[PDB]
Design a protein around this ligand. Structure first.
Ligand code: 1EP
Length: 557
């Protein structure tokens, strides 16, 4: 029962890979300690292969089956629709990997007869054949980090034609089923502000709250055939068209359960018997499986009044405390149960008694004050990785602008406001690129966003208090200040001076640009303005946002 079998053929790149931080005239204004920042490349793929290759053993008890029967009962209330070829095509990212069958993501989106005819052939093949493993491409991801160096993460994905077919069969399923099954526990239904609220209310709802996060070591490689067949049985509980039931069974047997691994050169790298990281069902399957194993492990450990919060493999549990020594014992029994279920830990879970000290989705709750002096809870994170990626993006154009996604997701934070907003608005001003739409990622999905719409977006997601937060906690301020020293990022006093300039420059341009100046940089002036709601913010269609997670799902809006 190995997660993977290998042939020895290397995981190869598509193009030239850069590992060292590229430097330009703008680099030193953001970060001075260049040797701290690196990108992962296919060079390190071999080390990741060793890490993800292990034997999985599963022992399934009555808690597991009891939780599963309940999840199936809730899933049986879902009615999912089959997406048309047109709907599935328009959800394809413009720069999605081209098919091996002579058409690309632009041909898909434009409904070109060659692309549509190939789509109808893969579809016909899925209905007629439920046995033949579907070929996948294994590629090393190029991701930027700060040191103290990780090996490249791997992406496993099927051909463009299959990805469009996954959309037709399962887009409605993966978008509606997890919230029905898990209710408030499904993390991807919340905006960052709704998440902070969910976490604070849950913590408050316990008499003696105890919280922990559970890190499953290499979650995708811990996922067994059983887990993948169990996810399918959950999907089949829905009220589906018979053609969809057929495509779901077929995609499960032929792709989701496993298949051969092919490099960018066309060589067989080996075989996968675990979760594929680049399929439509990666996020949904991981969230359902993580929730099933943890809900069963909560019952095994006899955890009192457990509230879970699940986003793929990211798991947070808020429960009733039985005192520090019993809680430590409860977590050992929880870990033992998770291990038996084939979800062993990376770092052992640690009980926490301060909500602010709990990290989930690489984030923690923190407190600041709005203009009226009210204590406002918001979500933040260690800024090291957002800052290292901002440094890379300062010198290289990338298919996914992390800085824009970070400004959207972490708009009320000290570091996103003072550094990210200031730095990138300065760059866009100098290049006259404020109106240029940039692609970013929100819950794994791709969005093309105009930076000029940032104030309207921030207002709708976080409220006007995002533009007015002050009096950040000493814990938060010190983490940011330490991070800046570590990376050689100028101190925050430099950023406030620079932001006054970025603000004056945005105001000068008038219109949408002045709106960015007025709202985004109101913190930088001593004589603050009274910020009122933006009329355009109500006109924004923010549906599709915070409904589901689509990490590795090839989704564009
Ligand atoms: C921020 C951006 C670079 C990118 N987009 C996204 O949804 N995540 C994952 C993510 C980010 C924030 C959250 C919170 C906890 C703030 C809702 C959850 C998941 C990313 O890392």
């Amino acid at each position: 029962h190995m997660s993977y079998t290998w042939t020895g053929a290397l995981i190869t790149p598509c193009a030239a890979e850069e590992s060292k931080l590229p430097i330009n005239a703008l680099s030193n204004s953001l970060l001075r300690h260049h040797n701290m920042v690196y990108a992962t490349t296919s060079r390190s793929a071999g080390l990741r292969q060793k890490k993800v290759t292990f034997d999985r053993l599963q022992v399934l008890d009555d808690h597991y089956r009891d939780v599963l029967k309940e999840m199936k009962a809730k899933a049986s209330t879902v009615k999912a629709k089959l997406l048309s070829v047109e709907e599935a095509c328009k959800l394809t990212p413009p720069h999605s990997a081209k098919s091996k069958f002579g058409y690309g993501a632009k041909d898909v989106r434009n409904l070109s007869s060659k692309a549509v005819n190939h789509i109808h052939s893969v579809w016909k093949d899925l209905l007629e054949d439920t046995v033949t493993p579907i070929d996948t491409t294994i590629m090393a991801k190029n991701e930027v980090f700060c040191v103290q160096r990780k090996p490249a993460r791997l992406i496993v994905f099927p051909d463009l034609g299959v990805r469009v077919c996954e959309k037709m069969a399962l887009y409605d399923v993966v978008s509606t089923l997890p919230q029905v099954v898990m209710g408030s526990s499904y993390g991807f239904q919340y905006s960052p502000g709704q998440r902070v609220e969910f976490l604070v209310n849950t913590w408050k709802s316990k008499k003696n709250p105890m919280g922990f996060s559970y890190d499953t070591r290499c979650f995708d490689s811990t996922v067994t055939e059983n887990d993948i067949r169990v996810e399918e049985s959950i999907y089949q509980c829905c009220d589906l068209a018979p053609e969809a039931r057929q495509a779901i069974k077929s995609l499960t047997e032929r792709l989701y359960i496993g298949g051969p691994l092919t490099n960018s050169k066309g060589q067989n790298c080996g075989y996968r018997r675990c979760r594929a990281s680049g399929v439509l069902t990666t996020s949904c399957g991981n969230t359902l499986t993580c929730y099933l194993k943890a809900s069963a492990a909560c019952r095994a450990a006899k955890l009192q009044d457990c509230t879970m919060l699940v986003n793929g493999d990211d798991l947070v549990v808020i429960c009733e405390s039985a005192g520090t020594q019993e809680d430590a014992a409860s977590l050992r029994v929880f870990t033992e149960a998770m291990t038996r279920y084939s979800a062993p830990p990376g770092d052992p879970p640690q009980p926490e008694y301060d909500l602010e000290l709990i990290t989930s989705c690489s984030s923690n709750v923190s407190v600041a004050h709005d203009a009226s002096g009210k204590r406002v809870y918001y979500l933040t994170r260690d800024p090291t990785t957002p800052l290292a990626r901002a440094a890379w993006e300062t010198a290289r154009h990338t298919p996914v602008n992390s800085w824009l996604g970070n400004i959207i997701m972490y708009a009320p934070t000290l570091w996103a406001r003072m550094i990210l907003m200031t730095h990138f608005f300065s760059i866009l001003l100098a290049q006259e690129q404020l109106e240029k739409a940039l692609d970013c990622q929100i819950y794994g999905a791709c969005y093309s966003i105009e930076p000029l719409d940032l104030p309207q977006i921030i207002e709708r997601l976080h409220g006007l208090s995002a533009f007015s937060l002050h009096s950040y906690s000493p814990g938060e301020i010190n983490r940011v200040a330490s991070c800046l020293r570590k990376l050689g990022v100028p101190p925050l006093r430099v950023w406030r001076h620079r932001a006054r300039s970025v603000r004056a420059r945005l105001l000068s341009q008038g219109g949408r640009a002045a709106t960015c100046g007025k709202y985004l940089f109101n913190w930088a002036v001593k004589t603050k303005l009274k910020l009122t709601p933006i009329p355009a913010a109500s006109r924004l269609d923010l549906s599709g946002w915070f409904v589901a997670g689509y990490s590795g799902g090839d989704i564009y809006h």
